[PDB]
Amino acid sequence: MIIVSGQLLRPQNWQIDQDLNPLLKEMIETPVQFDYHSIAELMFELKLRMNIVAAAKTLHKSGAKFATFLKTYGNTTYWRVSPEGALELKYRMPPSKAIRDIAENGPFYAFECATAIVIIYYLALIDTIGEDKFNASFDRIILYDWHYEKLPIYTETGHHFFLGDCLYFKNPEFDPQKAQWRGENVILLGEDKYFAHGLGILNGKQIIDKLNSFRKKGALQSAYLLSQATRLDVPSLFRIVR
Amino acid sequence: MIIVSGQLLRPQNWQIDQDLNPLLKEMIETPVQFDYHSIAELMFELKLRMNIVAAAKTLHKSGAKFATFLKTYGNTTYWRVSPEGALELKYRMPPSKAIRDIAENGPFYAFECATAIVIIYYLALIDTIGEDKFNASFDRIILYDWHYEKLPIYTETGHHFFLGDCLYFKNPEFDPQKAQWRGENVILLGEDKYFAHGLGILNGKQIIDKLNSFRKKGALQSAYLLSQATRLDVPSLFRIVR
Ligand SMILES: [Zn+2]
16 A cells, blocks of 8 residues: 555556566555555665565675685675674774675675675665665665664565565574574565575575574474565665665 | 544543653644554554553763764663664574663663664663564664664654654755755654754754854855654554554
8 A cells, every 4th residue: 555645555557677576566555554655665675675576686686605604704805804704994994985886796705694685685775775875875884694784674574575574583492502593584585585685586495495404403383474564764865865 | 633443532531651641642632643443553653652651751861972973982781883884783693682781871872863863762662662572673784874773754744843852954965075964854752852962952943053154164054954854654663563
C-alpha cells in the first residue's frame, strides 16, 4: 500500500524502468503501508532497493571471501585492519573509492556476513546517489559487524518481505562449539532467492539444510526463516543526503 | 497525541514513575502522533527518553572532555584509539562496563560531539534494557563520529521537539579555518535547555552566539536551530526487550 502526501496510490501508465516493476507491484499490493512525502521519495526507494539486490550480486561475484573477525583482511591501499578485525578507512581516503574497491579488487578482501550486508548498503547507496554526495555525507567509515555511519536502519516484525530486504535464517539448536552457524544474514534477491556471504546465491531450503547440518547432538528443531526484515529508512535518508 | 494499537490515549490514574508524568503529558498534548503496539512500548519510550536526558547530564558531569578526532583518547584499559581517532572496544572487553567507564572515569576520555551523542544513546540504552540485554545485542563497539552498532536512528523534519531529542544548531557561514564550528549537535534537556559536548548546558541564544563568534568575515547568516530531530526508533529497539 503506497501513500504519497496523503493519496493512496492505486494502479495509476508510468514511464519507469522495467527492473523496478516487480518491486513496485509488491509494494502496491501488500497490506504494508509505505508512506512518502513525494513521488521522488518513492522512486528513490525503488532504485535503492534494486541497487541493494544488484550490489549483493556484485559482491557475490567480486571474489571477496568469508573470514571470521580475527582473520579479516582488506586492501591496504584503502583500509587498515584493527586488532579485533575492523576495516578502518585510512586517513583522508575517499569513502566511495575505498568501498567500490571491495567490488573491483575482491580477492584482496575477506570479512564476515554482517560486515558484507553493510558493504552492500554502501555500494547500493553509492549506485543511487553518486560518489560525490556519498562522500560528502558518509565521510568517515569503519566496516565491522553491524557498524554503520549515519545510516537509518530499522528492523520490523512480520511475514511480508520485499526485494532488497535483509532477512535472517536462525539455527536455534546450533552446535555451541561452532557459533558461526547460530544463523545467517541474507539479502532477498528474488522469490525464494538469497545472497548469503560465505555461501553464495541460494534458496531457503539450501540455507536451512546447511544450518541444520551444524546442530547439537539430538537437536530436533530445524533452522528457519525468522519473521522480520531489516530495512533502510528512505525518508530519513532524504534528510541525510538529498 | 498518543495512539496504541489504533486507540487514542486521553488523560487516564496510572501507577507510573512521577519522573515520567511530564513527558507523557507533553506527548499526549502535542499535535504530533506517537503510535505504539502496546502500553509496554510507550513506557519504554518514556523511560528511554528520560534516560537520554539523564545520560547527557551524566556525561556533562563526568569530566570527559571535548577533543577533535586527531586528539581523541580513552581509557586504555577498555579502548584503543585508531590513527584516525576511533575509540575501539578492545578484544573481549565487556561492552556495558567499557561504556559505563566513560561516566565513572570521565577524565580519561576526550572525544568530539557526534561521538558524544552516540555514547549518550548507549549509556541510556544500558539504563533502559539492562546490561545483559545490552551485552547480548551490542557485543562489538567502535565509538567514532556517527557510527552505530545496530542502533535504529532516524532524523525527521519538523519543529515539535521532545525531551531527549537530538537537535542541530547549524552555523551556515562558519569560519572555514575553524571547521569544528560548522554546527553543534545537542540533546534537549528541557525548555530552551541543551547539552552540548564541549560547551556545557546552555540555552539556544548562548549556543548561537558562540557559533556566531566563529564565522567568516562579515557573515550575515546567523547560526540557527534546524527544524529536525534525530531519534531512536522505539519499535525497532523494543524488539529487544519483548
Ligand atoms: Zn592491547
